[PDB]
């Protein structure tokens, strides 16, 4: 993990995410939306739970991206919760929650749920 | 459960649900949207897992409502997953998934998630 997590990850929609996993559980980096234009980049911050694993379990982690930068303000934030599995074909399997700020009346429809799998290729 | 589940349930938004829990795990009834006009009623079908409970656990259940009737076709369906707790103040605590039919491009945004608590009052 940590060294194994640090790097560029890609998902099946065309998004790219680049993270540095720090020694004491920190996850810092940027998320880039498709097109890959100069600033389809947003800041991401998260944490991972490092442990001794004598049974090949994955490393639990999560991160958040607020969809606001100097070109866009989508008034929403997404959190990804999942685990990192390293090896020949390392991947991060996640489930995410995307919440939009709404008025109280629309709070019932404020959160979407999905899943993403990220690979190094 | 079963006898305890059968009846009218109300949630915190103003929706009403009326179910009959059949002997062999069936859940059949109707869901009514706020206003409570003649047909804000949709059919609901589900199942519940009946067991001997010597430790006061809740009864797991779930049901589905397709949002189509003779006045509306909202092209979506919602499933509620939760448990029934009976007693003085019996309630059904749930988490739901509402999926809309979308084109493949919008499949990422097709499902919302929420939670509802239903009571007999």
């Amino acid at each position: 993990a940590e060294a194994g997590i640090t790097g560029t990850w890609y998902n099946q929609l065309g998004s790219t995410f680049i993270v540095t996993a720090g020694a004491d559980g920190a996850l810092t980096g940027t998320y880039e939306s498709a097109v890959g234009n100069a600033e389809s980049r947003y800041v991401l911050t998260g944490r991972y739970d490092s442990a001794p694993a004598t049974d090949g379990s994955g490393t639990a982690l999560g991160w958040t991206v607020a969809w606001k930068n100097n070109y866009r303000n989508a008034h929403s934030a997404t959190t990804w919760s999942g685990q990192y599995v390293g090896g020949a074909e390392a991947r991060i399997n996640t489930q995410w929650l995307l919440t939009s700020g709404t008025t109280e009346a629309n709070a019932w429809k404020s959160t979407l749920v999905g899943h993403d799998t990220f690979t190094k290729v | 459960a079963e006898a305890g589940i059968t009846g009218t349930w109300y949630n915190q938004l103003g929706s009403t649900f009326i179910v009959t829990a059949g002997a062999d795990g069936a859940l059949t009834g109707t869901y009514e949207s706020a206003v409570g006009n003649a047909e804000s009623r949709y059919v609901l079908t589900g199942r519940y897992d009946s067991a001997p409970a010597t430790d006061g656990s809740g009864t797991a259940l779930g049901w589905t409502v397709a949002w189509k009737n003779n006045y509306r076709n909202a092209h979506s369906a919602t499933t509620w997953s939760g448990q029934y707790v009976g007693g003085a103040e019996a309630r059904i605590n749930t988490q739901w998934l509402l999926t809309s039919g979308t084109t493949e491009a919008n499949a990422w945004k097709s499902t919302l998630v929420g939670h509802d608590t239903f009571t007999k009052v």
């Binding site: 929609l13 939306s33 498709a34 969809w67 989508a74 | 491009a105």
Partner: peptide, 8 residues
Amino acid sequence: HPQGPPCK
């Protein structure tokens, strides 16, 4: 939304 696929 910036989290989606290309719109293309």
